[PDB]
Design an enzyme around this catalytic site. Sequence first.
Site, PDB file in Angstrom:
ATOM      1  N   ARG A   1       0.819  -1.207   0.000  1.00  0.00           N
ATOM      2  CA  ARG A   1       0.000   0.000   0.000  1.00  0.00           C
ATOM      3  C   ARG A   1       0.856   1.262   0.000  1.00  0.00           C
ATOM      4  O   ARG A   1       0.526   2.243  -0.675  1.00  0.00           O
ATOM      5  CB  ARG A   1      -0.946  -0.014   1.198  1.00  0.00           C
ATOM      6  CG  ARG A   1      -1.851   1.185   1.225  1.00  0.00           C
ATOM      7  CD  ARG A   1      -2.759   1.182   0.011  1.00  0.00           C
ATOM      8  NE  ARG A   1      -3.376   2.486  -0.215  1.00  0.00           N
ATOM      9  CZ  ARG A   1      -3.977   2.832  -1.349  1.00  0.00           C
ATOM     10  NH1 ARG A   1      -4.040   1.959  -2.351  1.00  0.00           N
ATOM     11  NH2 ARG A   1      -4.508   4.048  -1.482  1.00  0.00           N
ATOM     12  N   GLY A   2       1.970   1.253   0.735  1.00  0.00           N
ATOM     13  CA  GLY A   2       2.869   2.396   0.702  1.00  0.00           C
ATOM     14  C   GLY A   2       3.461   2.633  -0.676  1.00  0.00           C
ATOM     15  O   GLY A   2       3.629   3.776  -1.104  1.00  0.00           O
TER      16      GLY A   2
END
Lengths: 267, 266, 267, 253, 273, 256
Positions: E210-211
């Site tokens: 997700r980062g």
Amino acid sequence: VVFPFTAIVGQDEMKLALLLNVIDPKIGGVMIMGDRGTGKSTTIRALADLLPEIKKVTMVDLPLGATELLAKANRGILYVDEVNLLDDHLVDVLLDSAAGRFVLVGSGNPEEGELRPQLLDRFGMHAEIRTVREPELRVKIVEQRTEFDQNPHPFCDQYQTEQEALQAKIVNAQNLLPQVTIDYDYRVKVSEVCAELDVDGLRGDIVTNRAAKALAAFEGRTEVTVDDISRVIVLCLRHRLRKDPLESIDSGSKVEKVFKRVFGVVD
Amino acid sequence: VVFPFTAIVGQDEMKLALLLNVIDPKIGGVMIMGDRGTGKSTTIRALADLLPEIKVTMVDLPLGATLAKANRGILYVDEVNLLDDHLVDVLLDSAAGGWNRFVLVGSGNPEEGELRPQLLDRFGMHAEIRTVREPELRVKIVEQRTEFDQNPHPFCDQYQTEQEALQAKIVNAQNLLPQVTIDYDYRVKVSEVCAELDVDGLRGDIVTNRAAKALAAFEGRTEVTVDDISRVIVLCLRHRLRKDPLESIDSGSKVEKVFKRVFGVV
Amino acid sequence: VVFPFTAIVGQDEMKLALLLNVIDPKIGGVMIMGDRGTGKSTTIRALADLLPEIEKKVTMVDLPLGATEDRGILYVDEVNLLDDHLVDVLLDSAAGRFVLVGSGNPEEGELRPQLLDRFGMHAEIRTVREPELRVKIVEQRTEFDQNPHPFCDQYQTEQEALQAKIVNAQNLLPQVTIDYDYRVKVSEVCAELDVDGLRGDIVTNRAAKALAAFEGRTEVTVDDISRVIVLCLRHRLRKDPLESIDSGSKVEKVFKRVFGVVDEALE
Amino acid sequence: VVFPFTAIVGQDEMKLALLLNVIDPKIGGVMIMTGKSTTIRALADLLPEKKVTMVDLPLANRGILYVDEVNLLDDHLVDVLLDSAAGRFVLVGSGNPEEGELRPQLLDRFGMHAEIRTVREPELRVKIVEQRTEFDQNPHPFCDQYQTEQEALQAKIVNAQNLLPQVTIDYDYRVKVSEVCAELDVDGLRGDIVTNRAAKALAAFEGRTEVTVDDISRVIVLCLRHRLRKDPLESIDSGSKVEKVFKRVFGVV
Amino acid sequence: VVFPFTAIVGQDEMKLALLLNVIDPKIGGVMIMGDRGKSTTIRALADLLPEIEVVAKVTMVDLPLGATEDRVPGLLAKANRGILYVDEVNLLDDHLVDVLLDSAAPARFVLVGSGNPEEGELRPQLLDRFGMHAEIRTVREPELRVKIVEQRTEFDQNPHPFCDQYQTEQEALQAKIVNAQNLLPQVTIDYDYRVKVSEVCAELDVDGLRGDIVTNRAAKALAAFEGRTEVTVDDISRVIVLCLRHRLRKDPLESIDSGSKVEKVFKRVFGVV
Amino acid sequence: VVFPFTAIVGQDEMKLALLLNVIDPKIGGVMIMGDRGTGKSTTIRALADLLPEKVTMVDLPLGATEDANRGILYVDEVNLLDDHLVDVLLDSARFVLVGSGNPEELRPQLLDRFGMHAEIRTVREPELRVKIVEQRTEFDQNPHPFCDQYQTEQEALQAKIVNAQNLLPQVTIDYDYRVKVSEVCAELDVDGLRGDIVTNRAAKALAAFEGRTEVTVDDISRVIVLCLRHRLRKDPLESIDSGSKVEKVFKRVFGV
């Protein structure tokens, strides 16, 4: 049909405690605290199925929370699978009913509240189960279980004469126990071990004597021997220790260490 | 039928506490602490069976909620560690120290609770049971227990004259107690011991005096002797200690040490 | 349409646990504990879609959060909740027929030691650390969301090749044998790890045979055992809290010792 | 029938605290930390006038109220009773160690803090015991032996109450009392007020109208030892610190 | 009338986080943690966006302490094409937070949440699903602090004369937002940059990918805001702390600031002089 | 009738904090943490009885309800009923909020919302302690002769309050001072700008009280600890008094 007792491998200490209680139920029952759970329920059923009839011997399970099943349990076996939370007082009455006429057998769960010290000392013997460490023995058990699961009757028949030989030895041992004597010098040195272990009371003195006689009877002898005491004393006294918390020593090793000194055993 | 009191071996300190309370119930009862086994319950039944008919009634009181009208009897509180209603314990103490008259006996659990200095100081004596360490004595006790279990009546008969002899000594001691006197110098040196132990209050002064008089009465004497005080003072004061926590000294050994100094025993 | 199993990258240890259970469901299921950027929900969906047709497709059944008591795949997303009662019942359906798969949350209640040992294998998911692989997963994932059908076709023959291998492995599993010396050394590793019971011995043997069957061989190889033994035993450890050693690293360390696996130091 | 007040031996500090509160109840009551229940009834039986009634609080104007365990009965109930006192009846409370040490905000509100130490003189302990059993065996011959001493102290109490309005304390003394309170870091001015009211009550008890340095000396530990704000770094007795600071401020050789 | 967004001084990092979410709402929302001008900045951003139609003005929806799904018409719908501000997301834990993250992960909106320290740190599984983590530090320049206060009273006394003083700057920023949204599809990030972004996420031991996604969507949105179509190392530099500091898995043996750790590893991987 | 405000001795810091709030209620109230019993409730009654027009003092009890203005509101124990009731009162503050608390402490987040923090220390001068007590009994015995003894001083103080309120709009603070006030707040790591605002409002109120329209460096000196000592973010490794830290930073920034 149940797994034949004489085929259970790798549980010698627990089979001894169960056999001595069948010979002398006044020993006071067996507390089975094998943190490693393996072959606990099936061993006790194998021993019941092995005993002779006098009507067949009946094994009773301690389920639910019946206040009061000691009815169908006289001259038999009573198994309390989880006596670590089974009321608080009902345990007291059963330990009395076993020390004056049935084989009390109890099991516990680790990390759920280890037997309260007031209710464990009243158990005759303390048998611990450690899972077999010999590799080829572990393989034999696994190979035996699937071999039994596939063909029960050819398996049970393979052990049929060994079951009967053990069945006669139990009967002979029960018949001979009244003549079994322990020398005064041995009986005294047994109490010296109980004293140096700081046992709470004289119950430890009593069980070790009843156990040593029952073992000698099992082996067809009428005089208790120093080696007879050696094979039962850890079962009888290791859960009766009053050791300081400052000691990192094994309880079973403490009893063996003190036993060897008092009796003068060279290993 | 119950195991005879005069056959119990290896519990002399507790048999002394029980006999002195039977002679003078105003001592305030007996707290029995120590080994859980060693038949604590059966010794008190044996003592009841031994008392004369004025049969004496023995009371159980096991885990209840308010069985206390057996005057001139015995009340055994097996687990007075679970009388979380301290108010039940407190009334039983004062009534025992008067005629409201009965012999209070209580037992407790170590490492569980109670034993609070407020709930322990009100007991007359503190009898400790240590299980016999002499091997041949343990064998003798065990050989006696089944010998009684196999043949109760032949066992009780072997002790029958000793049971009757002890029964006469109890009645005699009760009858002789009013004339038993303690010298003023002893009475002061007893109080010096209680003060030098920093006991909470004067109850320790009172019980030690009543115990020493009862012991001399038991032994058919009317003058309390230094040896009489010697045999009761640990029962009376070891649970009344106010010792510093910096002390690795045994409580019962502290009482003996201060008694020996004050009275001058060498 | 579902993301194709043969396209999932970076979960090799977990895909191995699932494939071996599909080949031999008596292994006892897979407990999936680890990271969240994977999608244990879609990898198990991909595996159901990959299996052969049952006569419709093999059915994948999901157990949601609020789930009360009541030949496929069963995914228990949160086996930390739904107390031991419900969890105990599902493990029976397994062992000696469906592929039990469970997932857990860290810090929501550690693996209950008595109910975790009954899971066949323990697969941990670690998110990919190779940068160009992380980019590939993301680029593949959005590429699949815009055009599912063109994506699945790029992998359609590779799905069929893996599908045939699964069937071949199931068909060949009965002939797969493990040498006696290997069978004993597997038990020696279980003993030296102080595993609770013999369940670790059994799944390691069933898992090694299933892997050898997957690769079209009928003799279990030391390397076959190497690739499954960590999945099989790392959640069966009883290590002292005084040890800062990784559980999976402990199993590899003892395995290499017992079997004597060392790297040839080439010049 | 109750044990006569004038026969109680070995409790001098507590009998002083009780007598002064009976003389001037605005002192604010007594916190008692060997049988105080009967000592307070002995004091009730001793007061004049129907006779004064002593009230027990197990779960009363112009009398005496004894709260046996003011550690329990949470701050709500305890707060209400302290109002009835101060600037009218004699509040008496006792406490238990290890039962919830009286909150520091709830102990400062007691006028005086009297400690009971069990007698250490052996011949005195013997005398007390002989007095108790002699009283239990023949109560009325015992009370009669002390009847004239009870009446004498009863007249002193009435006189002291009658004389208190004329009792004065020198301005220099009143200031040095406040220096003692300040040097002790007392919470508020209540210590200044109680020590003043107590010194006057003692001087009135002894038939005098001018408070003396010795009058303050005999009341100041009762008034200030439970009002200390001393560092925990001090292994010094609280009652001894009050005497030590009193001796310095007033210059007692 | 509301304080004009372009007049807010000293919140640059939070203004960046909010603007980029307005440019690319798929970034995933903003978690605002720090000192306690928070509720008033978001309405100014709502007031700044261009007036929208019913279905083919932007609406700001708040949330008081009482939720218990008294929003799922309710409140979830009023956030359509708008902004939803959760004042205390460290309370109403578990389910209510999960549902909102889903509704923004028939109405799409820019999720904005604020929390209280010591009254509960949002369970790490639900804080990672927030796109960015913007912290507010109170202005330290003394002459700036005087200006903020003097601007507050000046606005309270004369709202409409104040808004006019900033009216053209509001229109210029409004046009830049519309342009950035229109330009976002063409914004590309080089493969070498895209890989080095993932290298930073891995070396920070971030939970999942997700980062990686948020930093990429943020870098494109920032480059679009500035009228460019190629993501630059400096573009990534200005968003990477917003995107990754609440995604750290750092050892407790480190007294290093989480946002400062991201800057150091970013500089290392990219080779910033 | 109540003890006259001008007769209260030895509480100068709390009388200062209360007077400024009466002059400029937008300061935000007073948190009274006096670790000594000195009659906190009666001083606030004394201050109410002194104001013109009559006035009104509301005293909230421990058991708050679920629902006064242009008066004074005293929260004797702002520890209890704190979850929301305390939160609600800080919002409504138009009235002079006054709260007292007992140590063994309000939420570090709900204490920052109080305007000023005045601590009460019990008088240490012996001859002063005697005078206070002598004043209390003299007032209890003869209230009206006592209040008359202070009647003109009450009127003199009353007029100054009216003058300060009437003069407050013209009171100015120099820009160089206003920045140096904010520099003090920054070096104190104050949470927000609330400390900057109250110190400014308090300094103007003090200058207005003394009949002046220009804030003086000394005006800031006499209020800044009241305004900033409960807004500190100091390290726990510091054995330094919070109020003493504010004086230290103030002296440096302004150069005193």
